[PDB]
Nucleic acid binder design. Structure first.
Ligand SMILES: CCc1c(C#N)c(SCc2ccc(CNC(=O)CN)cc2)nc(N2CCCN(C)CC2)c1C#N
Ligand SMILES: CCc1c(C#N)c(SCc2ccc(CNC(=O)CN)cc2)nc(N2CCCN(C)CC2)c1C#N
Ligand SMILES: CCc1c(C#N)c(SCc2ccc(CNC(=O)CN)cc2)nc(N2CCCN(C)CC2)c1C#N
Ligand SMILES: [Zn+2]
Ligand SMILES: [Zn+2]
Length: 842
DNA sequence: GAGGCCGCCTGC
DNA sequence: GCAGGTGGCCTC
């Protein structure tokens, strides 16, 4: 009792398409939505749109089902509106007998007045439902967790009766994934030359720059097998009784495992080998490139990288043939003297830009002029920055050219004053953001200081980082902690988003924002954005990959209004230690990644502690002079950038905490070799600067787990080294050069690795802290050579702040301002992705 | 106000 | 077990 209605629309092969069918008491036509029975009766019904109806000579009565995704199957899980569906590129042929019923599915489109329709209370944002039939508003990418406006793919007259948009988009994706050759230049003896080729939607022509993996080719300058570090030569165990705790071969902050950046070539030929009959084998695409040298690839090796621009290359006449499938992306490489602009303007004007001024001759180990054949606005968004701090995120967005931060909210006054000092045109509110929003919603125009409150339409971009105090555990919500979340600053920030409805929205936070409360904080944040009707996504970024010598992972939530394009996450710019670049996120057993494809290498070398601060003058422990001489010119590219173009005769805030006499003696005895920390301290008496004496540490109890030194000395410093015995107060020792508490509890704290630890010139900072303390958790705060902790200026350099960026207050206030900020280079990379969306808006 | 002192959880 | 990820609070 399955009956076709009418004559066949088209007969193709063993298929006869129809526009309408009758099943029992119902009639179905293309475009109708149906439910479909699953094998597991416990599982819910599948829902689909019918995109075609045909009789098959071998399969019987058939239709094409374009499946909807239930909201509960997305990252939103159980927080989803129970009747919300999402478009996905999932579809298949199916027998008509599997249809259970016809269902109503409504497209809930945002209205033309969407930007004025905000103001629902937090309960409505978090838990409110549409309360109607099935509906969709957004398309969903299940691997990247992206909610976007539905695609506008269009059918022709050759497919209108059977058009499946999912089939069409999948076919486009497949074609985009396959390398192809387009033009045709010449036919040689054993190969065919081509003028252009395409890969992953990128067009490559003869003469373009290509990124290649570091293994793609070698240079004529082969290598120098370095004198490797020996196997930890023995030390005097009586002099250094805690050195045994360094049995791990892992050094915090070391760049020994960072990969090489990309090889860079200029396409000389694009070609295919010929078949036996003369035709080209276009499944086998090759390119011949000229090799570019980075400075560190010449005979001068790594030190050549110290002073050179990070995008400086050297031309050479060496050539390599590589598979086209190895290309990692396209880049622009230009001879510097032929630019219509200076090198700095060129380098700041776009991505993937390199330049060369000379050619390198490997045979002669010399430099030459390149050969002739090597030659050949947008209005800013009015931005509100909530929980701005001193303004690192706003500074990076400003550098990207996308925003003017006209309003900022910062409750901690020294940070608010710093933000004002750097942004004279902005209005900085110090009130509770809840109070400010309530005033705006009540129709107030100015706050109690006479500052004008932003109104609907004023705010075009909203960014901030809300604290998660009270719900930053990993365990599941309960009634109390869920109430704390509902009344929290995260939800207040979401309320700002709902009321103002900016074009773009950014929430930044610590990495574990994606995992707090079994990922429910993340899921609810996304749920609120979708409930407002925003496009949105999330991901994790590593700041070191965008140009700071610092490991700092951040969770990022991005949203874009209906009518906008949802931004992509920025591709890594700098290679960085892979152990610090774990960006994936597991939510309810589903592993999510961002759109980022640079997982193994990148265009630029890693930024080091040397890059960051080798130019700063020597200062002492407790340095307090607020304005001093730099004592020399900037040395590295990074320093040239951060000092800026205008000559700065005064270096500011190169001041350090005044550590006590005992702490200073300890710092003076930490060796300079990489990986040095408290475990390298000698066990000696030392006279302190205040006349007092630092004492030897005595070993008073036998530590069965840790054994004894080679002279038979014990290794415990307290009775608690026994199984169940408590701590003996008489066993506590004071004013020892080796701190008593570190051997006291080291066995359960990974030997307190990194406390009193030195940075290394070749390595990177641990996450820049708000108050550098050698015996705190983030204790690796000692200068690579000087006997002091890092200065405020050095922390600001680790964050990528320009040297001209003003700070405010006492030294601890300035450290906290620096340590709480988003690094401007990270903020700038994100902002450039938003700029791409602004320019591409349809 | 410094600096001594040092829990709990998770991914691998 | 190893390494990372969240700082506060005595005591004076
Ligand atoms: C978010 C990923 C996802 C999405 C997305 N996106 C979808 S789309 C809905 C849909 C897609 C395809 C079919 C065809 N049948 C098969 O694929 C099995 N051979 C039916 C329904 N469904 C999902 N569920 C429910 C459908 C059936 N299971 C695969 C269980 C997983 C899941 C999941 N986790
Ligand atoms: C037991 C702790 C808890 C937890 C935990 N753990 C959670 S998880 C968040 C969540 C879970 C399920 C849904 C589905 N409900 C819908 O309505 C869908 N639109 C939405 C959100 N939520 C909670 N409350 C409270 C009232 C019930 N409401 C759901 C609001 C949220 C509570 C609580 N007390
Ligand atoms: C390794 C250093 C360390 C550290 C370090 N670092 C920490 S941090 C603890 C912490 C405090 C506040 C927040 C903020 N709270 C929210 O945000 C609300 N959700 C988070 C974590 N605790 C430590 N113990 C445990 C707590 C304090 N004593 C009981 C003993 C010492 C220790 C130690 N030894
Ligand atoms: Zn299809
Ligand atoms: Zn003890």
């Amino acid at each position: 009792r399955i009956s076709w209605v009418g004559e066949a629309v088209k007969t193709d092969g063993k298929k006869s398409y129809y526009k309408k069918v009758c099943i029992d008491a119902e009639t179905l036509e293309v475009g109708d939505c149906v439910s479909v029975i699953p094998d597991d009766s416990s599982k819910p019904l599948y829902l689909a749109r019918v995109t075609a109806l045909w009789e098959d000579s071998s399969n019987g009565q058939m239709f094409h089902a374009h499946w909807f995704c239930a909201g509960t199957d997305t990252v939103l899980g159980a927080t989803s509106d129970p009747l919300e569906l999402f478009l996905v590129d999932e579809c298949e042929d199916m027998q008509l007998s599997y249809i259970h019923s016809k269902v109503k599915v409504i497209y809930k489109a945002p209205s033309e007045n969407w930007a004025m329709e905000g103001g629902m209370d937090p309960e409505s944002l978090l838990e409110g439902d549409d309360g109607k039939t099935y509906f969709y508003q957004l398309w969903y990418d299940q691997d990247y967790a992206r909610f976007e406006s539905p695609p506008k793919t269009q059918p022709t007259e050759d497919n209108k009766f059977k058009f499946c948009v999912s089939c069409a988009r999948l076919a486009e994706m497949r074609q985009k994934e396959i390398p192809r050759v387009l033009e045709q230049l010449e036919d040689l003896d054993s190969r065919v030359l081509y003028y252009s080729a395409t890969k992953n939607g990128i067009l490559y022509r003869v003469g373009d720059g290509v990124y290649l993996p570091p293994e793609a080719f070698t240079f004529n300058i082969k290598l120098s097998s370095p004198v490797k570090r020996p196997r930890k030569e023995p030390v005097d165990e009586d002099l250094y009784p805690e050195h045994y705790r360094k049995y791990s071969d892992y050094i915090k902050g070391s760049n020994l495992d960072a990969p090489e950046p990309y090889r860079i070539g200029r396409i000389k030929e694009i070609f295919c080998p010929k078949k036996s009959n003369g035709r080209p084998n276009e499944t086998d695409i090759k390119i011949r490139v000229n090799k570019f040298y980075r400075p560190e690839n010449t005979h001068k090796s790594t030190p050549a990288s110290y002073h050179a621009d990070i995008n400086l290359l050297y031309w050479s006449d060496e050539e390599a043939v590589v598979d086209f499938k190895a290309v990692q992306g396209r880049c622009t490489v230009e001879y510097g003297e032929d630019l219509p602009e200076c090198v700095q303007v060129y380098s700041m004007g776009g991505p993937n830009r390199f330049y060369f001024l000379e050619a390198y001759n490997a045979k002669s180990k010399s430099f030459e002029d390149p050969p002739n054949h090597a030659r050949s606005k947008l209005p800013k968004l009015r931005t509100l920055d909530v929980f701005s701090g001193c303004g690192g995120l706003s500074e990076g967005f400003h550098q990207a050219g996308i925003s003017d931060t006209l309003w900022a909210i910062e409750m901690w006054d020294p940070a608010a004053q710093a933000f004002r000092l750097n942004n004279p045109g902005s209005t900085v509110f110090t009130e509770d953001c809840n109070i400010l929003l309530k005033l705006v919603m009540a129709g107030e125009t100015t706050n109690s200081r006479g500052q004008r409150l932003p109104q609907k339409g004023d705010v075009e971009m909203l960014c901030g980082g809300p604290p998660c105090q009270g719900f930053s555990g990993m365990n599941r919500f309960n009634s109390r902690t869920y109430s704390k979340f509902k009344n929290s600053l995260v939800v207040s920030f979401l309320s700002y988003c709902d009321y103002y409805r900016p074009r773009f929205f950014l929430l930044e936070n610590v990495r574990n924002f994606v995992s707090f409360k079994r990922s429910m904080v993340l899921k609810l944040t996304l749920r609120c954005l979708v409930r407002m009707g925003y496009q949105c996504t999330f991901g994790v970024l590593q700041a070191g990959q965008y140009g700071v010598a610092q490991t700092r992972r951040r969770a990022i939530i991005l949203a874009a209004a209906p009518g906008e394009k949802l931004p992509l996450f920025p591709e890594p710019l700098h290679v960085f230690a892979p152990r610090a670049c774990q960006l994936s996120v597991v939510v309810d057993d589903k592993k999510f990644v961002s759109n980022i494809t640079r997982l193994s290498s990148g265009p630029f070398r890693t930024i080091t502690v040397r890059d960051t601060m080798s130019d700063l003058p020597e200062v002492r422990n407790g340095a307090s002079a607020l304005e001093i001489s730099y004592n020399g010119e900037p040395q590295s590219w990074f320093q040239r950038q951060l000092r800026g173009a205008q000559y700065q005769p005064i270096l500011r805030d190169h001041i350090c905490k005044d550590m006590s006499a005992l702490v200073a003696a300890r710092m003076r005895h930490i060796p300079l070799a990489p990986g040095s920390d408290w475990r390298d301290l000698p066990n000696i008496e030392v006279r302190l600067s205040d006349g007092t004496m630092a004492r030897k540490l005595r070993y008073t109890h036998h530590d069965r787990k840790n054994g004894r030194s080679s002279s038979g000395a014990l290794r415990g410093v307290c009775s608690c080294v026994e199984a169940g015995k408590a701590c003996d107060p008489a066993a506590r020792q004071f004013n020892t050069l080796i701190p008593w508490c570190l051997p006291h509890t080291g066995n359960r704290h990974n030997h307190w690795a990194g406390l009193y630890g030195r940075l290394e010139w070749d390595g990177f900072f641990s996450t820049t802290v708000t108050n550098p303390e050698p015996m705190g958790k983030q204790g690796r705060v000692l200068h690579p050579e000087q006997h002091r902790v890092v200065s405020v200026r050095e922390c600001a350099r680790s964050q990528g702040f320009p040297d001209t960026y003003r700070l405010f207050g006492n030294i601890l206030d300035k450290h906290r301002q620096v340590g709480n900020a988003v690094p401007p280079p990270l903020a700038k990379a994100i902002g450039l992705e938003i700029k791409l969306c602004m320019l591409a808006k349809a």
